[PDB]
Amino acid sequence: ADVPAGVQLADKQTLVRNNGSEVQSLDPHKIEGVPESNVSRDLFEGLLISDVEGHPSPGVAEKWENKDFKVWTFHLRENAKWSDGTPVTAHDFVYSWQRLADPNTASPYASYLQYGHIANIDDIIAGKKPATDLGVKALDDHTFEVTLSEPVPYFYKLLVHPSVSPVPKSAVEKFGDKWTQPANIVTNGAYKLKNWVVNERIVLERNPQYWDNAKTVINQVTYLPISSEVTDVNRYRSGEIDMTYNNMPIELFQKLKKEIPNEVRVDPYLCTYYYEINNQKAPFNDVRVRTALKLALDRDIIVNKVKNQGDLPAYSYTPPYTDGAKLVEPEWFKWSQQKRNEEAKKLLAEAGFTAPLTFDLLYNTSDLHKKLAIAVASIWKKNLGVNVNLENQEWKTFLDTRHQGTFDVARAGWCADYNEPTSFLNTMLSDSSNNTAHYKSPAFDKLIADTLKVADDTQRSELYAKAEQQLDKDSAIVPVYYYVNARLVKPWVGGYTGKDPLDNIYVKNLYIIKH
Numbered sequence: 001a002d003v004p005a006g007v008q009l010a011d012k013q014t015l016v017r018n019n020g021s022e023v024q025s026l027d028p029h030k031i032e033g034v035p036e037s038n039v040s041r042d043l044f045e046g047l048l049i050s051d052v053e054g055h056p057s058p059g060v061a062e063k064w065e066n067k068d069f070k071v072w073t074f075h076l077r078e079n080a081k082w083s084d085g086t087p088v089t090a091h092d093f094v095y096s097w098q099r100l101a102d103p104n105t106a107s108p109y110a111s112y113l114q115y116g117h118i119a120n121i122d123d124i125i126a127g128k129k130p131a132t133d134l135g136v137k138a139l140d141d142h143t144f145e146v147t148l149s150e151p152v153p154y155f156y157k158l159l160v161h162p163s164v165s166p167v168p169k170s171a172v173e174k175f176g177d178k179w180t181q182p183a184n185i186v187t188n189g190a191y192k193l194k195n196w197v198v199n200e201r202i203v204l205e206r207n208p209q210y211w212d213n214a215k216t217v218i219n220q221v222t223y224l225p226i227s228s229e230v231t232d233v234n235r236y237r238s239g240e241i242d243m244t245y246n247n248m249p250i251e252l253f254q255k256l257k258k259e260i261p262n263e264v265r266v267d268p269y270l271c272t273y274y275y276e277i278n279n280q281k282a283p284f285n286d287v288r289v290r291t292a293l294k295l296a297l298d299r300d301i302i303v304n305k306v307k308n309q310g311d312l313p314a315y316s317y318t319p320p321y322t323d324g325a326k327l328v329e330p331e332w333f334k335w336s337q338q339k340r341n342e343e344a345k346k347l348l349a350e351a352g353f354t355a356p357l358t359f360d361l362l363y364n365t366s367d368l369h370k371k372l373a374i375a376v377a378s379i380w381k382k383n384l385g386v387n388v389n390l391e392n393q394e395w396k397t398f399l400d401t402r403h404q405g406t407f408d409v410a411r412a413g414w415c416a417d418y419n420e421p422t423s424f425l426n427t428m429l430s431d432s433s434n435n436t437a438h439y440k441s442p443a444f445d446k447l448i449a450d451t452l453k454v455a456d457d458t459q460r461s462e463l464y465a466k467a468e469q470q471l472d473k474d475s476a477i478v479p480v481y482y483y484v485n486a487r488l489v490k491p492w493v494g495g496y497t498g499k500d501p502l503d504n505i506y507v508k509n510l511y512i513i514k515h
Contacts, residue, residue: 001217001495001511002052008514010492014220015510018232020245021364021395022199022225026180028165029100032108032399032434034415034503035245037162039223042204042507044165045189047074047093047144048156052509054419054500056157060088060166060188061144069151074144081209082168083192090138090145092166099172100163102131108403109163111433112417115426116158117452119149125431150452157418160504165189190216190508199225204507217511227395229367236488243496246487246503247368253309253486262491266310267498269485270319271415272424273311275361275376275478278407280438288347289357290475293409296344296383297376298337303481306375310486314479316468317414318424321482321501325421326461330472341383348384357386359408364398369411372480402436412436413483416502421464422448428471439476491515 003009019035028044031037041049047061061074080088099105101113101124113121119135135147148155158164168186171179178184185193190212191204202223206216224241226232229249233256235241246269257264277284277293284290299313315333318325332340348357361377363369370392377388388409393401401407416423427434430445447467454460471477485503489496495510 001215001509003217003494003511007494009217010512010514013218013512014222015218015243015493015507015512016222016241017224017243018226018236018241018245019202019223020225020232020247021227023202024396024399026185026193026196026202027177028096028162028167029105029107029109031162033395035225035395038505039202039204040162040165041189041504042191042221043187043189043193044162044167046159046161046165047076048159049506050160050500050502050504052495052497052500054502054504056160059160064156066155069153069155070148072146072148072155073139074146076142076144077211078142079211081188081211083187083207083209084168085209086168086170087141088166088188089141090143091141092169093144094136094138095169096166097136097164098131098134099167101125101134103127107163108399108433109161111426111429111431112158112161112163114429114432115422116146116155117148117150117152119147152452153457154418154420154422157420161417190506191221194220201225210508212508216508218507221507227365233488236490242490242493244488246485247366248309248486249367250307250309250371251367256488260488263488265485265487265489265496265498267485268321268501269415269483269503270322270419270423270501271413271483271485272314272317272319273411273413273480273483274314274317275480276402276410276412276437277475277477278405278409278438279440279474279476280405281408283351283353283357284359284408286351287475288351289353290478292344292347292351292384293380293386294475294478295332295340295347296380297478297480298379298383299480300337301379302372302375307372307481310484311481314481315472316479317428317471317477318421318464318468319416319482322416322421322424323419324457324461324464326465327468328465330469344384348386353386355385357384359386359388360391361388361409361411362391362393362398362401362407363411364395365392373411405438409478410436412477415483419501421461422451425464425467428476437476439471439474441470441474441476444470444474 023036045059049059051057062077064074120133123129175184192207194203194205232244430440451463492513492515
């Protein structure tokens with residue numbers, strides 16, 4: 001943390017945060033969500049971290065070099081330590097990325113190393129070679145070398161993600177799946193796990209082995225798993241919580257805006273809200289059915305009349321304000337709603353539905369989502385005659401259901417892991433481990449794979465625009481809105497600028513002002 005000369009630090013340095021729901025796990029190779037990542041960044045540190053404005057900065061690596069953006073060399077700081085006082089070395093990385101890549105780990109983010117194009121990743125994912133063949137190696141105890149099969153100029157931006165954080169071999173091998181309990185867990189980020197009471201709370205305390213421990217200010221942090229947005233704002237307003245989760249209730253939002261405007265933080269967020277369709281299940285394997293759903297949803301109504309929190313109406317997967325994006329708005333988005341509706345009733349009738357398509361719409365337990373689900377079910381009923389049945393599951397189960405394919409249409413949100421369009425686009429590759437839409441298009445795949453062979457960034461951005469158009473002509477998903485990051489932060493929380501579009505908060509960077 002960097003307390004501005006002049007301010008007064010509270011006597012007690014503690015912070016309570018709402019995390020939106022119970023984490024899937026705390027093992028870095030088993031998580032995929034925003035809540036899990038929030039906790040993960042306070043416990044595990046990889047080569048690079050983001051600074052307070054979102055820029056990639058030195059983490060365990062102190063310096064790194066590249067040869068043609070193809071061979072990356074990371075020089076780890078000599079004092080990096082695990083909470084057990086043992087040293088973090090490059091072997092910890094080698095082992096770690098080997099475990100992520102390995103099919104027996106079954107990480108939902110196994111594909112992250114195909115996103116970075118580490119040599120031999122495909123064959124390893126496919127079982128043709130063993131994980132030990134991955135293009136990574138410790139040159140010495142402090143130099144970690146990565147070999148990519150293609151130059152990836154943005155490779156260092158991917159490395160702030162939790163999946164590429166190191167995990168401690170000794171604990172993993174002893175304790176297996178139980179290595180993450182308070183008893184056995186071993187960490188290397190600014191914090192270490194104090195307690196973990198499921199459906200109750202996660203409490204972390206400063207880690208004395210941490211290399212930047214001298215700058216760390218907050219001593220204890222509690223992460224709450226509250227999935228009700230009304231309760232989060234209420235317990236905040238009662239003084240029990242310092243920073244809510246960043247999902248605001250439709251209900252009390254404009255209210256709060258009038259009573260406590262400077263506690264209402266609203267910033268650009270690189271996330272898209274959409275209805276994910278299971279592209280493999282009849283009748284959603286028909287493009288006419290997918291397109292009719294896409295067209296008949298009225299975004300003006302959802303974004304400007306039922307949510308009204310500043311979100312922008314969406315026509316693409318990748319948010320147009322992503323660095324490097326240059327998207328074309330499709331025709332359909334320029335029509336009026338009535339014209340989209342006419343066109344949607346004709347594609348359905350052509351696919352054999354009249355007076356009706358019936359299907360389930362799944363959401364994760366939440367006051368916000370339930371509200372938009374009912375609103376969308378009524379809009380699709382009214383505009384298209386489709387009957388929807390609503391289903392709700394808890395966070396963990398919801399994620400498992402989408403990976404497994406046992407849903408029709410699900411409410412979804414994807415946030416960038418690094419600010420570059422492949423952070424979105426790579427999740428639609430046929431073999432991606434994050435492809436919960438189950439979309440498979442050889443034309444899409446080839447557009448993305450060509451992006452690593454162009455010579456220039458301009459060429460690169462034109463293939464990103466054509467990939468978004470290929471996804472839109474397939475109507476793989478139903479784009480709803482590009483998010484704003486809205487949460488409530490108490491006046492006495494310092495360090496949180498809110499200017500990072502990825503929202504990569506580190507508790508080590510915050511500090512409680514005297515109050």
